[PDB]
Design an enzyme around this catalytic site. Structure first.
Site, PDB file in Angstrom:
ATOM      1  N   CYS A 742     -27.595  -2.954 -46.674  1.00  0.00           N
ATOM      2  CA  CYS A 742     -27.698  -3.083 -47.255  1.00  0.00           C
ATOM      3  C   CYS A 742     -27.720  -4.155 -47.669  1.00  0.00           C
ATOM      4  O   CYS A 742     -27.612  -5.833 -46.803  1.00  0.00           O
ATOM      5  CB  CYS A 742     -26.016  -2.721 -48.604  1.00  0.00           C
ATOM      6  SG  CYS A 742     -25.180  -1.601 -47.377  1.00  0.00           S
ATOM      7  N   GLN A 743     -28.543  -5.069 -48.680  1.00  0.00           N
ATOM      8  CA  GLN A 743     -29.164  -6.276 -49.290  1.00  0.00           C
ATOM      9  C   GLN A 743     -28.682  -7.048 -50.498  1.00  0.00           C
ATOM     10  O   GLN A 743     -28.147  -6.791 -51.337  1.00  0.00           O
ATOM     11  CB  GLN A 743     -30.777  -5.813 -49.094  1.00  0.00           C
ATOM     12  CG  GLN A 743     -31.439  -4.405 -48.910  1.00  0.00           C
ATOM     13  CD  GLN A 743     -31.114  -3.766 -47.886  1.00  0.00           C
ATOM     14  OE1 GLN A 743     -31.990  -4.044 -47.016  1.00  0.00           O
ATOM     15  NE2 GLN A 743     -31.222  -2.983 -48.185  1.00  0.00           N
TER      16      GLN A 743
END
Ligand SMILES: Nc1ncnc2c1ncn2[C@@H]1O[C@H](CSCC[C@H](N)C(=O)O)[C@@H](O)[C@H]1O
Ligand SMILES: [Zn+2]
Length: 1064
Positions: A742-743
């Site tokens: 995830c970013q």
């Protein structure tokens, strides 16, 4: 004459912090596009041009144009090179007041000169030289632009000085001091603004003096070549840091090959374009609606007979009328809050009674709005949560009766379509009521526990009893009964925090109650003492005799000895009862259990020796007596691992007995081979999860619930019949674990659609497993203003999970690395949510906290910095028995030559005779010299390197001190830890994750050997056994170790799930 160059320290105050050069495209070398260069005047060389250029030294650091000669010198001690796109000499000039078909991409040879020509005012041109040709310059790259802007600023200053030396005319009038004065009075908007202080102005002029000195030679007029300013600047300059080269006229020729650092270096891989995630329509709706809205007198009577009596003799009722409306047990009522602006509060009716005199009274439980929990803006307008808080009010204080129901829905993949249709029906009804503007209907499904950090299932038989008896009231009464010191009976024992201490028990006492990589040094573990009697001083004190640990004799004896060993003594202390932390057990050595686990998990010690504190001698226990050494004596789930890696989480979850990793999805070849090497009975898919989920949905007929791109559709159609028949269909998966990358950014939603958390959540939505585990970095709870975390929780709550969140520290479980991770546990409505493991090692961490909203925090486990059951684990405990290796050792299979000594080196090896992957990254010659000139002490780094000039085997002269970032002002802190060495008695930093050998090295050197940490050594700092195998090249193996969850921490987590699987 001699050409004065001003060293980088004098000019560094103006340039940014050091950074380095990267590229992805192949570059031709310069020397092959031109024939051999014999004796030629520098006038007659090819004239070309460059676009998207950069300049760098032999370490690939960005460097200025002021460190090259303005003229032709003989010997140069600085090695500067560059990149550029070759084109034709067209005649571009740069305008101060303010095309690339890739002719070819080249990397340049040794740059030996540059040049500035003066066109009209505010129009100049800049050209450079190598030994084969002349190159003219154009627009710089984005990243080298900050090193381009300071040169043009000095160009502006020089132009200004020319202007107001000739505007005033009488050229021979102004003086260095006069120019300093007039420059200093300029307003802070003119482009020639140096500073308002005379001394800063003269500093700037003298430091950058050669640019002005040439601009005062190529400006067409015979009035500025003899000016007092011109000769003053040259007579000055010497009193700064300077190098002295020799100016001679020569006639060029190649002598050397291209010594560019990029010669023979492969381009780095790409930054593969993000593709739109394959999601389901439920997850799409949840994440898309948010990003399209947000960031883009009255009578009262009891109704019916009596039900019973409370435990005070008072009647108990179920149904009451508050002026026309009906109030029932299990319903909800709204009370009018003090300030008449906020929304009212809603209470769940538990029981109603008639007080002793005469009153109409109810007892309620607090129902909270999802707007004010950790969910916040991601919560439904109609979802209420149940809390632990109670309330008693009169039945005249209500504002009105709310509409409320409890939502109990069936579980399974087999029911997830009927659920979707029913959800859509309710959403349509809600919009209709909102437009006609009728009341709101509320629902509750979970329980909010901010002190346990999760959403748990409703205890449906405990709520709404109508029997005068509330569960939360019991819990609060018990929690206040727990906090009193209770000496049992007359004497012989007591109660503190729910632990009964008796006489002849063994206890844990806080170390202070009895008396850089270095953060556990000086940190001590519990004191193990035996309770003797109770003394009067009712408030009492206790008499204890103590045990000495191997830590307290010397450091070497702690290295040699088992971690569960204690030394007898004859020392007594009288203590207050509030220093006692817990109870343990001490047996004889022969009575110790036969089963050894690497995370120890039990509170058992043993004693065999004596410690005489007066003489400091260890001797056998005095036969004279003995100190009554009391303590006289299928659930495995079918698993899918998504974003697998090498198998750190699956190894620990299979060791503990819960997982059998039957399917796995890792899209890289090296990590997939590494996984299949260690879990040979697992089915591995080396494919993107976006194509795998499309294929899985296509295999079930559910291709209309899929949100996919056409290229992924084609890739899913390009599968072999063999691969399709080995796919997991929904029904066969009972556990899903994963580490999605995830970013964090903002979106555009267009830039959020490409995130891998959406596909992971769609896997959970399609399969609906019993258990779900998510691991990610600790920053996950603070990405995008906390919106990813809030939306992840709301997505998992729209399906029907119980959710729990926490941050754990790996060093408190038995490793030498300080890795902080964020975990989310999800379980079905009818399961038990796993607890958190107990930290039993001492680590210096301050209790990681997650911010629930409204001014509250949550912390999952405790902090062990003031005392824990076991001793910290050091660098010598981890890498002390391994043989000695050298720079760039590639031999994969070696042998063991020494035996184990410490507890950790007896756990890690086992019965293994083959030493695999004891290999290290090769440093080049100049980095090796620097690593050999660093002292073998704690906290030794690049500040210890002498300032000196190194001559190499190429003939290159280089500088010993690497990056230069002082800029003599703040915006740096000395950059501590770079080119750093470890400490035998400390721990591994979290900067040895993928050590880099060339530019910004970090803290990765061996404590005594002149080399970087090997792959095997980095594997032991995370708890990987010596038998575990890796695959690929050295970079891929380091990446596989860096991305992994430590197998010790994964064993502790999986052992708590095995307890939750027995309680069902
Ligand atoms: N779209 C995608 N599909 C499948 N795998 C991916 C992916 N994007 C990244 N990955 C892989 O997923 C892994 C994420 S790292 C997960 C680490 C794992 N917990 C462990 O225990 O070792 C990386 O190896 C990466 O190569
Ligand atoms: Zn209550």
């Amino acid at each position: 004459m001699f050409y004065i160059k001003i060293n980088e320290d004098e000019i560094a105050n103006d340039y940014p912090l050091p950074s380095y050069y990267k590229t992805s495209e192949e570059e031709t070398d310069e020397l092959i596009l031109y024939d051999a260069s014999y004796e030629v005047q520098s006038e007659h060389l090819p004239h070309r041009m460059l676009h998207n250029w950069a300049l760098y030294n032999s370490d690939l650091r960005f460097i200025s144009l002021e460190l090259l000669p303005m003229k032709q010198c003989d010997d140069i001690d600085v090695n500067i090179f560059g990149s550029g796109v070759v084109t034709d000499d067209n005649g571009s000039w740069i305008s101060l007041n303010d095309h690339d078909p890739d002719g070819m991409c080249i990397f340049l040879s040794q740059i030996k000169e540059w040049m500035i020509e003066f066109g009209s005012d505010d129009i100049i041109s800049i050209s450079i030289r190598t030994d084969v040709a002349w190159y003219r310059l154009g627009k710089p790259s984005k990243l080298y632009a900050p090193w381009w802007k300071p040169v043009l600023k000095t160009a502006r200053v020089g132009i200004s000085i020319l202007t107001f030396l000739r505007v005033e005319s009488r050229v021979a009038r102004l003086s260095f001091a006069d120019v300093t004065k007039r420059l200093s009075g300029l307003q802070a908007n003119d482009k020639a603004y140096i500073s308002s202080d005379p001394l800063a102005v003269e500093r700037y002029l003298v430091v950058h003096g050669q640019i002005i000195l040439q601009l005062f030679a190529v400006y067409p007029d015979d009035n500025v070549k003899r000016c007092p300013f011109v000769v003053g600047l040259a007579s000055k300059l010497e009193d700064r840091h300077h190098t002295k080269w020799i100016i001679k006229k020569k006639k060029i020729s190649l002598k050397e090959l291209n010594l560019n650092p990029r010669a023979g270096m492969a381009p780095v891989a790409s930054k593969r374009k993000a593709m739109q995630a394959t999601t389901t329509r439920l997850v799409n709706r949840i994440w898309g609606e948010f990003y399209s809205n947000y960031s883009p007198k009255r009578e009262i009577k009891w109704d019916g007979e009596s039900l019973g009596k409370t435990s005070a003799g008072e009647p108990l009722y179920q149904q009451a009328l508050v002026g026309g409306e009906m109030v029932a047990v299990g319903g909800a009522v709204t009370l009018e809050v003090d300030d008449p602006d906020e929304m009212p509060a809603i209470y769940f009716v538990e029981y109603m009674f008639e007080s002793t005199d005469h009153c109409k009274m109810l007892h309620g439980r607090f129902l909270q709005r999802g707007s004010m929990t950790v969910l916040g803006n991601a919560a439904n307008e109609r979802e209420l949560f149940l809390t632990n808080e109670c309330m008693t009010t009169q039945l005249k204080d209500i504002k009105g009766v709310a509409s409320f129901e409890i939502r109990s829905r069936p579980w399974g993949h087999q029911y997830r379509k009927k659920n979707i249709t029913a959800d859509k029906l309710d959403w349509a009804r809600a919009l209709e009521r909102k437009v006609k503007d009728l009341p709101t209907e509320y629902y509750c499904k979970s329980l909010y526990s901010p002190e346990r950090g999760g959403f748990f299932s409703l205890p449906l038989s405990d709520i709404g009893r109508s029997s005068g008896f509330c569960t939360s009231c019991k819990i609060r009464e018990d929690e206040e009964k727990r906090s009193t010191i209770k000496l049992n009976v007359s004497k012989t024992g007591f109660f503190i925090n729910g632990i009964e201490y008796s006489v002849e028990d063994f206890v844990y006492v806080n170390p202070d109650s009895i008396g850089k990589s270095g953060r556990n040094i000086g940190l001590r573990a519990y004191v193990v003492c035996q309770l003797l009697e109770i003394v009067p001083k009712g408030s009492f004190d206790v008499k204890v005799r103590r045990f000495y640990r191997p830590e307290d004799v010397s450091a070497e004896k702690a290295y040699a000895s088992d971690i569960q060993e204690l030394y007898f003594s004859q020392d007594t202390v009288v203590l207050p009862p509030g220093a006692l932390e817990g109870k343990c057990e001490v047996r004889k050595k022969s009575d110790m259990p036969l089963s050894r686990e690497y995370p120890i998990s039990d509170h058992i010690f043993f004693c065999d020796l004596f410690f005489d504190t007066s003489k400091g001698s260890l001797k056998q226990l005095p036969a004279n007596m003995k100190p009554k050494f009391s303590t006289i004596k299928e659930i495995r789930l079918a698993t899918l691992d998504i974003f697998a890696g090498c198998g750190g989480l699956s190894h620990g979850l299979k060791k503990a007995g819960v997982s059998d990793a039957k399917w796995a999805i890792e899209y890289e070849e090296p990590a997939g081979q590494a996984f299949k090497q260690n879990h040979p009975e697992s089915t591995v898919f080396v494919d993107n999860c976006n194509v795998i989920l499309r294929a899985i949905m296509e295999k079930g007929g559910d291709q209309d619930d899929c949100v996919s791109t056409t290229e992924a559709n084609e890739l899913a159609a390009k599968l072999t019949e063999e691969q399709k028949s080995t796919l997991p269909l929904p029904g066969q998966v009972d556990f899903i674990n994963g580490g999605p990358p995830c970013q964090g950014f903002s979106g555009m939603w267009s830039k959020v659609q490409c995130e891998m958390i959406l596909a992971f959540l769609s896997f959970a939505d399609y399969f609906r497993p019993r258990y779900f585990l998510l691991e990610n970095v600790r920053t996950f709870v603070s990405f995008n203003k906390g919106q990813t975390f809030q939306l992840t929780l709301a997505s998992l709550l729209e399906m029907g999970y119980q959710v729990r969140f926490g941050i754990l520290e790996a060093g408190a479980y038995g490793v030498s690395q300080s890795r902080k991770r964020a975990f989310i546990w999800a379980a079905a409505p009818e399961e038990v949510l796993p607890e958190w493991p107990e930290p039993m090692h001492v680590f210096g961490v301050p209790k990681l906290k997650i911010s629930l909203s409204q001014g509250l925090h949550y912390a999952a486990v405790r902090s062990t910095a003031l005392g824990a059951p076991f001793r910290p684990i050091t660098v010598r405990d981890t890498i002390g028995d391994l043989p000695s290796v050298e720079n760039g050792d590639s031999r994969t299979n070696k042998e063991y030559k020494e035996v184990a000594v410490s507890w950790f080196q007896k756990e890690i090896r086992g019965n293994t005779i083959a030493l695999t992957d004891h290999i290290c990254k090769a440093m080049n010659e100049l980095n090796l010299i620097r690593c050999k000139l660093i002292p073998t002490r704690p906290g030794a780094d690049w500040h210890d390197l002498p300032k000196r000039k190194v001559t190499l085997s190429d003939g290159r002269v280089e500088e010993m001190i690497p990056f230069c970032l002082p800029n003599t002002a703040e915006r740096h802190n000395g950059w501590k830890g770079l080119y750093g060495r470890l400490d035998w008695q400390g721990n591994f930093p979290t900067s040895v994750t993928d050590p880099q050998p060339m530019g910004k090295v970090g803290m990765c050197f061996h404590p005594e050997q002149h080399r970087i940490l090997t792959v095997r050594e980095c594997a032991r700092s995370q708890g990987f056994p010596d038998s575990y195998e890796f695959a690929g090249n050295i970079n891929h193996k380091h990446r596989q170790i860096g991305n992994a969850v430590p197998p010790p921490l994964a064993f502790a987590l999986g052992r708590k799930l095995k307890e939750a699987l027995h309680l069902k």
